Design goal:
The structure is a homodimer of 263-residue chains.
Chain A (H helix, E strand, L loop, with lengths): L5 E5 L7 E2 L12 E2 L1 H13 L3 E5 L17 H7 L5 E2 L7 H4 L2 E3 L4 E3 L1 E6 L7 H5 L5 E3 L5 H8 L3 H12 L9 H10 L4 E6 H8 L6 E4 L6 E3 L2 E3 L4 H14 L2 H12 L6
Parallel strand pairs in A: 1-4, 1-5, 9-10
Antiparallel strand pairs in A: 2-3, 6-13, 7-12, 8-10, 8-11
The structure holds the ligand CN(O)C(=O)CC[C@H](C[C@H](N)C(=O)O)C(=O)O (2 copies) and lithium ion (2 copies).
One lithium ion (LI) binds next to strand 6 of chain A.
PDB class: membrane protein
Keywords: AMPA receptor ligand-binding domain, GluR2-S1S2J, agonist, membrane protein
Assembly: dimeric
Chain lengths: 263, 263
């Protein structure tokens, strides 16, 4: 049949996708800005399609409920045919790869530790061996699921600590995790993806830092429904943009070029 | 039909695949050791196949001749049906992705600079702005092709320099590049993948170092013929091994655990 506008699902998460300050004076895709908005434009230009940016209804990335077997988040929107492509900081994981297609990664990351400056922690092992400095994750997403599933001794110990710690060490949003680090006088550390950690380190009031090595190594990928014809072209576009240096240019644009914490 | 032994193509390159010192007393897959030998065993165990390690006949990774349009190297062995899978430090590139299937990356790398300790170079830009310290690449492979194709100003300038430099700055093997760095009294820098650079930095006589940031960011993938049914299982195996921490364990084993240059 005739070409149709491609429905893109994404999520509001700075600096990936944000509503522009003047969004009420704008329409359609022009309401949004950020790394993933720019990436979507480049992918569409290379693949030759028109598209519509939509925001995932349930605000989730993608997991399958053990009881109902239903996929939520952006993964669910692809699985159930509500969107054609997801362009977002969506981690490539085994269980997601079983149900949707992913491009090769467009950005690398690992789980990492965010501390308030001056907190005496240098590694995951350091955290795991103590309780005075509380630590936790989001209550949803691949970072939480990493800990919940891990059989690596240090990480399994961290998960057991997080489940049993009081008061709750879990947060609902990135903003809440960052605020908790900033307001807890060195007594809370937040486990999050290194990409986000690096972004926040360059935001005022410049009081956080990423410490130690990353806990794992993985990537974000562009996702499509399993078997979608769109997958091949989008993957080739990611590879081309990477080779051209354009993915690095976009990370620099949104993370560092207008960093607020000096040069 | 009945299951058949899977033909794996790979290449002799330390520390990925090496003939064991006592190889003449051994047979079959047991003749070989290294990171990729261990990785092959893990992939086969997860996917449930038997396999035979074979060494690529022409000693190349994979490129298409502009005149004959024939693919060489491990990519060629897959394209022409001489092997079922390639398990090697084979860089995922756009032009290769067009003709074979790749897993998600099992190892990250970027092009990097190897110097003899004490050489006054800290970046690609530094190299590009001078000629007293000669610099070059292998005469075959993705690093060479990166420079040949780049439209990034610094890298295009480096390529023009390399093509016109005398005596020739190209080398035929990794061993020749490393020897040239070691023997040139600080007057040769070798451009190579960061993985290899990091390996050599931990080998006696401990006189090289990796300097500056990487020039690009990419990955090695397990390759199969386009459309091969084996691709799905192998990709899921890579993702599982990564999540379990086993890829990092294997890199540590072959790069650092028996490093020769201290702790
Ligand atoms: C960058 N961004 O995505 C965030 O920080 C949000 C929380 C991520 C989601 C994760 N990428 C997923 O795909 O599940 C996490 O689980 O850490
Ligand atoms: C690790 N190993 O692979 C080497 O050092 C050999 C040379 C690599 C080959 C490259 N991975 C390819 O896939 O073409 C290079 O072009 O730098
Ligand atoms: Li998939
Ligand atoms: Li491919």
């Amino acid at each position: 049949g005739a070409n149709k506008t491609v429905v893109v699902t994404t999520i509001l998460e700075s600096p990936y996708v944000m509503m522009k300050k003047n969004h009420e004076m704008l329409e359609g895709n022009e309401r949004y800005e950020g790394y993933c908005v720019d990436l979507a434009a480049e992918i569409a230009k290379h693949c030759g399609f028109k598209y519509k940016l939509t925001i995932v209804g349930d605000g989730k990335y993608g997991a399958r409920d053990a009881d109902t077997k239903i996929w939520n988040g952006m993964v669910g929107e692809l699985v159930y045919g509500k969107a054609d492509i997801a362009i977002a900081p969506l981690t490539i994981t085994l269980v997601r790869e079983e149900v949707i297609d992913f491009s090769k990664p467009f950005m690398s990351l690992g789980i990492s530790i965010m501390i308030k400056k001056g907190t005496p922690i240098e590694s995951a092992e350091d955290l795991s061996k103590q309780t005075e400095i509380a630590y936790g994750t989001l209550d949803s997403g691949s970072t939480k699921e990493f800990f919940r599933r891990s059989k690596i001794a240090v990480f399994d110990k961290m998960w057991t600590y997080m489940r049993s710690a009081e008061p709750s060490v879990f947060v609902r949003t990135t903003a809440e995790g960052v605020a908790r680090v900033r307001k807890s006088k060195g007594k809370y550390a937040y486990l999050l993806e290194s990409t986000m950690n690096e972004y926040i380190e360059q935001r005022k009031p410049c009081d956080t830092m990423k410490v130690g090595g990353n806990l794992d190594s993985k990537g974000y990928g562009i996702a499509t429904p399993k078997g979608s014809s769109l997958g091949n072209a989008v993957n080739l576009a990611v590879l081309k943009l990477n080779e051209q240096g354009l993915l690095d240019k976009l990370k620099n644009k949104w993370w560092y070029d207008k960093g607020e914490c000096g040069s």
